[model samples]
Target: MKESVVWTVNLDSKKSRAEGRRIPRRFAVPNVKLHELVEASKELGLKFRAEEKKYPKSWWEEGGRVVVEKRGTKTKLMIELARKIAEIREQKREQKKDKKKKKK
Candidate 1:
């Protein structure tokens, strides 16, 4: 088994001419091991061939999200989670702005 895998869980949004664009709310997860990564890939219906040393074959899921190389779309649950997080962040920011305005 490999020493370790540098897994990064980041939220990404793809853009398409027909589908417009996705909301840019991004976050990252911690690193993990190859075995754990493999398990996650399987759970997410992502292709993961640890033995293979090729382009697409090697690429797999990070954790609770898809890898960058795969260019695979995120699951609906993941999208919804990210959307909610983004909304909360925006709301907090707006609240801060309002508080500042009130102070002035």
Candidate 2:
């Protein structure tokens, strides 16, 4: 089965709180990236695609959206997506931090 599950550009961190922040404050990271989302989607092992469509709220910025089939409630999946994204970032930091620490 194939479908275009619009992982709409609703989960943005640039927007102010309660305006359109889909996930919680803690999980929300500034300027969410396309690669970050795809990495998370990979972690979830879901069928997904990346698209370059502009979200109207901030027309100036090019919108980065991840298209994924619904494996669970849209919101719920994104919450976990959000979690995975942060953890990915954490791993990146740990790796880079370790590299930085190596300069003796």
Candidate 3:
């Protein structure tokens, strides 16, 4: 895993497309040398501000200064939802395996 940071910039999640693409959210800060940061920002449905120190400390952490966070409640909800999906998938797979064993 490359060192990555998620900054909480103004993500227009509504603007994000469902076209299936991977865009690193960490490169939104102006300091990152990746030239495609601008294009990535647009692609990721974010509007990256060029001004270096505009965001508040709570919105950003030092390393790579990318702001992709929401309030903890939202973050927690997303985590729990993902866990639930995985658990349900696991349960379905186990059920299928059990059925095969019974048939055998």
Candidate 4:
């Protein structure tokens, strides 16, 4: 009852706000995937449901969506996940770069 209804979709750096990019360009991830979205959301323990419904403007790829139970306000709800996804990707990058090396 006290939450937004728009389905949170993955960010595509290739698209501009006019093309339906939700978060700010600075924060938007390049070609963000649905799996990454769910993975990151699960980490944040947010309430959401995922679907393969292709997004309109950028409908070439799957670009599935997830309907989230607003965690806070509109911007918060959107950016919260946006930031989390970025965090998760960064972590992934770190993991890849610093793959467990045996103590010297």
Candidate 5:
């Protein structure tokens, strides 16, 4: 597995989404190049600045996963992408777990 962190937004429960909550989308990005992007973003000062919270930065910072609808539509697509990616990762995790259990 590669070393990576999972982040998310707008994929929470209906209640949460209704309130415009940006939840963390977890995924095993062991094979993803998340680190590379983080490094680049750090140099470019692209990390989430809280006040200026944006897309690339929203999912970059260690504590930058929280995104609100008030941030505007700039992050809508990114949030959707995160949700899809998280779903795929979750499915893969389940498959791996099932395979392991069967082997056991």
Candidate 6:
């Protein structure tokens, strides 16, 4: 069986946009496992915004608001949650591709 995961929780607290033009955030949540963090986001009422290239930033940085429980958008948690998920997914994909190349 898989072990239960744990993640560090942090509130989105920032308000800035002077970084890379992707809607910057004043605060960020760093250092946590992918699955654990994802679950935490769900529990906190956040969804994944796949369209946006960046996620896990301050809620204010993203487009309007995001949906928390249902399938709508009106909260800060959703966008940030999405960014975390994407980061993990991308990292895993790159790892797998790199491994395949090494085996060749």
Task: Give TM-scores for every candidate, taking all chains together and pairing residue i with residue i.
Answer: 0.27, 0.62, 0.26, 0.65, 0.29, 0.27
lDDT of 6 by residue, 3-94 (tens): 12111223222322332122123324332234434544465454331123256566654332221343333224334554654456456666
For model 5, give the 10-residue run with minimal summed lDDT.
1-10
Q: Candidate 5 — which pairs collide? A: 2-30, 8-25
Taking the tens digit of each residue's C-alpha lDDT, what string does model 1 give over 1-104?
Answer: 11211112333333232332333334311232343434544544633333423444444533332232223344433343344344544555567666867774
Give me the candidate number with maximum TM-score. 4
Ranking of models by lDDT: 4, 2, 5, 6, 1, 3
Q: Which tens-of-lDDT digit does each residue in 1-104 have in candidate 2?
A: 24344333445567665445566566675666665777877875765667765555666654666665655466665666677677776677677767877787
Which scores greater on lDDT, model 2 or model 6?
2
Model 1 TM-score, 2 decimals? 0.27
Candidate RMSDs in Å, in order, are 13.0, 4.5, 16.9, 4.6, 11.6, 12.0
Off by over 4 Å in 1: 1-8, 12-74, 97-104
Ten residues in sequence with the least summed lDDT for candidate 1: 1-10
- The true-versus-predicted C-alpha distance at residue 36 of model 3, in Å, is 37
Worst 10 residues of 2 by lDDT: 1-10
TM-score of 3: 0.26
- For model 5, residues 1-104, the per-residue Cα lDDT tens digits are 11222242233323244544343334223333333224323443533212223555455443333222223344343444344444564656667666876774
Give the lDDT of residue 50 in candidate 4.
65
